[PDB]
């Protein structure tokens with residue numbers, strides 16, 4: 320398992336943690352709106368994700384689809400959990416390992432989970448505007464990689 | 471000495487838990503709790519009235535209201551620093567600068583502990599715990615070491 | 618579910634008490650989650666059989682799997698509290714939450730095992746701001762989940 | 767002071783802009799404080815004369831005295847934002863805050879040096895949620911301090 324070594328480096332990287340908290344401050348202004356935007360981007364660039372999310376029904380309906388709405392809001396509270404864990408390696412490891420359990424049971428591989436990075440970039444461009452920087456995407460990719468190592 | 475004491479606070483999980491739990495109650499009403507703490511100080515240590523002469527009559531006082539609200543945000547700052555030794559040291563040393571200048575000794579500053587015990591007892595009710603008082607006395611001792 | 622949502626969102630007092638008590642609990646999310654789980658297993662040791670994967674739950678924070686669960690649980694509560702101004706949001710978030718609990722064969726009655734542990738946790742963490750109205754507000758919110766199971 | 771307080775507290779738009787922007791800043795109060803101080807000293811190096819005690823301010827976080835000041839500054843902002851619903855509170859909290867600034871011989875005009883640094887900090891931390899009106903809200907709040915000096 321690579322989870323512990325990757326988590327060590329996330330916790331020790333202060334500038335990267337700052338990028339995560341700064342960009343999270345913007346992403347979390349509108350938890351529902353941003354969660355829905357992220358999911359819409361996932362379905363755009365990985366349409367294969369529709370099969371894993373079939374229970375949600377017609378995902379093209381956005382906020383008008385109550386199942387998609389409930390999922391999209393709930394996803395953002397897992398991101399909040401991760402951000403709140405960034406200063407304590409044992410805390411980050413145990414919350415990432417907990418999170419991974421259901422994803423493993425759904426047969427979501429490290430490669431499939433990494434499909435979320437592009438969607439994160441696109442959502443960050445929409446939320447950051449003229450102040451967007453790829454350094455925020457690299458920061459989120461490092462955090463995503465901790466989860467990938469658990470899958 | 472600030473470093474030694476700060477390290478022990480940051481390392482003591484049970485004590486930090488008591489500080490955060492009790493702070494969760496004290497901070498529900500920042501204004502009311504701040505005023506309660508100050509009133510207890512003036513009752514117990516009459517000499518404190520003199521140090522606070524700019525506030526006027528502290529026996530309906532807007533200057534005392536402003537001070538007592540503001541005091542609670544320094545406590546919030548300390549509580550927010552409990553997981554990072556270097557953060558706790560730097561915020562305590564910053565806080566101390568004006569208190570040193572006003573000639574408030576470590577012994578005088580420790581006059582706050584009894585008033586904090588009375589405030590805790592008033593706010594915690596049946597769940598008041600003497601160990602919580604000891605935890606706050608330990609945090610106050612970090613500040614005293616900076617004076 | 619709709620009737621249960623309507624009861625919670627229809628009372629400004631229930632919503633206020635949920636928000637004010639959550640504010641207190643949020644002073645230490647991790648300690649809150651651990652305390653709630655400890656109260657669950659002390660008052661209702663029968664529920665330990667749902668948590669086989671977590672191992673020795675008596676160990677508390679020292680058990681990393683239990684710690685991960687205890688912290689993660691609080692983020693569902695955070696979401697519920699943030700949902701109170703919009704009945705349709707509370708409904709869709711609770712229905713989403715319920716899916717995995719239904720898959721674990723956790724009935725509404727079983728889920729309600731948390732009510733008395735939550736009351737004890739509120740008393741332990743709120744000091745003189747505790748009242749039975751605050752316990753009642755939490756029972757009403759848990760009732761929404763129970764109706765969805 | 768009364769007119770400056772009324773301009774802020776009487777405006778739902780100013781208050782909403784202060785609350786939303788503070789919400790964003792509160793994701794990282796330490797980084798916010800350090801970024802504000804960096805913008806102050808870069809855009810308004812004339813103000814360095816007031817901060818002799820801090821030493822080499824260009825060092826940022828690595829300068830522990832600067833770090834303690836930057837963190838502590840944000841708790842005054844927190845108090846101001848928590849005062850917005852109550853003109854009597856904003857008044858007495860700002861007048862309390864002003865006492866040491868008056869003692870340091872910081873005029874209203876001098877204190878105003880913070881305004882453009884605050885605008886740049888907001889631009890760099892709010893993304894697309896930044897607006898001219900958000901900057902204007904902060905200028906109005908700073909105006910309350912300026913009136914008290």
Ligand code: HEM
Nearest residue numbers: 368371372374390393394397398421422427431432434435
């Ligand atoms: C930032 C990345 C992600 C976060 C924060 C996230 C978070 C969550 C959360 C909190 C849940 C609810 C709890 C659970 O059942 O596990 C969930 C469910 C789910 N996740 Fe993810 N996840 C992410 C990425 C993905 C990706 C990339 C996929 C597949 C392509 C995926 C597939 C699912 C599925 C199928 C469910 C169950 C959905 C339902 O039927 O309601 N997840 N995820």
Ligand code: HEM
Nearest residue numbers: 518521522524537540541544545568569572574578579582
């Ligand atoms: C929990 C303990 C205490 C906290 C959190 C606290 C916090 C504060 C804060 C935030 C200020 C305003 C900033 C400043 O000027 O330094 C202040 C001012 C002051 N402190 Fe303290 N302090 C405490 C204990 C004491 C004690 C025990 C005394 C004296 C017996 C004292 C004397 C003062 C005085 C005289 C001022 C200036 C008051 C004015 O004219 O408005 N402090 N303190």
Ligand code: HEM
Nearest residue numbers: 664667668670686689690693694717718723727728730731
């Ligand atoms: C305040 C009440 C509760 C909250 C907020 C809560 C929340 C959560 C959350 C967020 C998860 C992780 C996502 C998932 O897999 O569904 C979870 C998992 C779980 N819940 Fe709950 N739940 C509560 C009460 C209960 C009760 C009373 C039981 C048992 C009777 C229960 C059994 C479980 C189990 C077995 C898991 C999976 C544990 C694991 O292996 O990691 N839940 N719950």
Ligand code: HEM
Nearest residue numbers: 813816817819835838839842843866867870872876877880
């Ligand atoms: C957003 C605007 C500002 C806020 C919220 C702020 C807040 C604070 C706080 C809370 C303190 C510590 C308590 C005290 O000693 O008064 C402080 C100290 C200080 N303030 Fe400000 N202030 C601001 C702007 C300014 C500006 C523009 C100047 C200079 C032109 C200034 C000069 C200082 C100085 C010199 C100190 C003492 C520094 C030290 O030696 O540690 N302040 N301020």
